[PDB]
Structure 1
């Protein structure tokens, strides 16, 4: 890999998110240790690990759930054993129990408290990367930027020097990073962020279907991926920042495979600002027909997209 961090999302701990606490192995699962070694064997040195705020912190501003923390720590042991980095992805869409950050129910400070506590747990660990929030939306760019600043500040107050991945609002889409149609863009809002620890990257996501949701197994052209990354890439360069593609995916077809090669090549060519990427997704709980799975088969066989991902790892 020409990029520092390449790998996959191991999805499953965030499943059935309505269920709180939910029951391990019934409503959600953590990854098998064998998942980590499989992806390591393909050249991937980074795992993004979705998990739920509600499961790790059952009451806002309250203590962390020790069982949930233990599961995260067990995944960290597996990552370290396989010489991987682990992104702790608070996979929450700027909500807690269905209520948006910024409402009276969920003040921005509550997210800062969550991250204070996780930072205290993982500060002494070079393998751990802090993924502040999966796909904030339903909150303005300046309000989200304020929430993000509070969270960065809370992490740094603990002494933690770990890399922080900071998203924008609008589902942190790379394509829409500079859009001012509806008001202030992520680009403008996030210009004012300060990290006293100087170890930040901006997390964007990019899907290649008509509305960039990853709802359909279509890539709208064989070049749309790289095209949609350009504005964000320039913004990184303009601001002397780094970026991380926290989710992206393409379906198993010729146009999509061309688009995938194009976007991976594009990030390599622009590795001055792209720190890395994590494909969506692997994990043991996807159905056989899920168009973006790279979880190896029960037969041990590689999924179609893995042959391309492995080339860039």
Structure 2
């Protein structure tokens, strides 16, 4: 891989998110150790690991749940043994128990407390990357930037030097990074951020269906992926920052495969600012018809998109 980090999301611990705490093996699962080794064998050195804020910290501002922390640490052992980095993805959409950050129910400081606690646990783990928040939305770009700043500050106060992946609002879409239609863009709002540890990257997501939601197995053209990364890529370069494509996916059809090749090629060509990417998704709990799975079959076989991903890994 010409990029520093390439890999996949191992989805499952964030499943059935209505259920709190939920029960391990019933409502959610952590990955199998063999998942880590399978992806390592395909050249992937990075695993993004979604998990829920509510499951790791069952009361705001309170202690971490030790069983949940143990599950995360067990995944970290597997990643380390397979020479992989582990992105801790707080997979929460800027919400806690369905209430948005910035409401009276969930002050921005609560997110900083969560990350203070995780940083204290993982500050001495070089393999660990802090994915502050999956797809904030329903919060303005400046208000999210303030919440992100508080979180970065909290992490650095612990002495942690780990890479922090910082999203924007608007589901952190690459395509909409610079949009001012509805007010302040992510581009403008996030220029304010300061990381005293100088080890930050901006996390964007990009899907290729009509509304960039990844809800349909369509890529609207054979070039749309690279097209939608251009504005964000330029913003990174303009601001001397780095980026990370925390989620992206394409379905198994010719137009999508061309788009996939194009976007992977584009990131390699622009490796001065792209640190890497993690495909959405693998994990053992996707249904047979899920269009974006790269979890190997029970028969051991590779999924179709993996033949392309592996060429860039």
What TM-score do you get using the length of structure 1 for normalisation? 1.00
Structure 1 residue 142 displacement after superposition? 0.1
| C-alpha distance in 2 between matches for 1:194 and 1:252 | 40
Separation (CA, whole Å) in 2 of partners of 1:134 and 1:274: 19
How far apart are the structure 1 equivalents of 2:218 and 2:134?
23
- CA drift of 1:217 comes to 0.2
For 2:23 and 2:89, the matched residues in 1 are separated by 20
C-alpha displacement at 1:287, in angstroms? Answer: 0.4
Whole-Å separation in 2 of the counterparts to 1:267 and 1:303: 22
- Partner SS state of residue 276, structure 1: strand
Cα deviation 1:24-46 (Å, max 9, x = unaligned):
00000000000000000000000
Q: Find the aligned partners of 2:288 and 2:126 in 1 and give their Cα distance.
A: 35
In the TM superposition, residue 213 of structure 1 has moved relative to its aligned partner by 0.1
What displacement does 1:269 show?
0.1
**Alpha-carbon displacement from aligned partner over 1:72-113 (angstroms, at most 9, x marks no partner):** 000000000000000000000000000000000000000000
Could you list the per-position Cα deviations for residues 261-287 of structure 1 after superposition, in whole angstroms to 9, with x for gaps in the alignment? 000000000000000000000000000
Which residue of 2 is the match for residue 187 of structure 1? 187
Q: Secondary structure of the equivalent of 1:205?
A: strand
- Please report how far the alpha carbon of residue 195 of structure 1 lies from its aligned counterpart in structure 2 after TM superposition: 0.1
* Alpha-carbon displacement from aligned partner over 1:196-224 (angstroms, at most 9, x marks no partner): 00000000000000000000000000000
Cα RMSD over matched residues? 0.1
CA offsets per residue over residues 161-207 of structure 1, 9 Å max, x none? 00000000000000000000000000000001000000000000000
Deviations 1:44-89 (A, max 9, x none): 0000000000000000000000000000000000000000000000
- Partner in structure 2 of residue 312 of structure 1: 312
Q: Match of 2:28?
A: 28
Name the SS for the 1:230 alignment partner.
Answer: helix
Q: Deviations over 1:90-147 (max 9, x none)?
A: 0000000000000000000000000000000000010000000000000000000000
Alpha-carbon offset, residue 158 of structure 1: 0.1
Cα distance in 2 for partners of 1:309, 1:298 equals 20
Aligned twin of 1:19: 19
* Structure 1 residue 160, shift from structure 2 partner: 0.1
* Cα distance in 1 between the residues matched to 2:118 and 2:96: 16
CA distance in 2, matches of 1:112, 1:261: 38
TM-score by length of 2: 1.00
Could you tell me how far 1:308 is from its partner in structure 2? Answer: 0.1
Task: Classify the secondary structure of the residue corresponding to 2:256.
Answer: helix
Give the Å deviation of 1:289. 0.6
> Which residue in 2 is equivalent to 1:223?
223
Q: List structure 1 runs of 4+ shifted beyond 6 angstroms.
A: none
Task: List alignment gaps of at least 5 residues for structure 2.
Answer: none
**For residues 169-184 of structure 1, what are the structure 2 equivalents within 5 Å?**
169-184=169-184
* Aligned residue in 1 for 2:204: 204
CA distance in 1, matches of 2:63, 2:205: 31
- 1:15 Cα deviation (Å)? 0.1
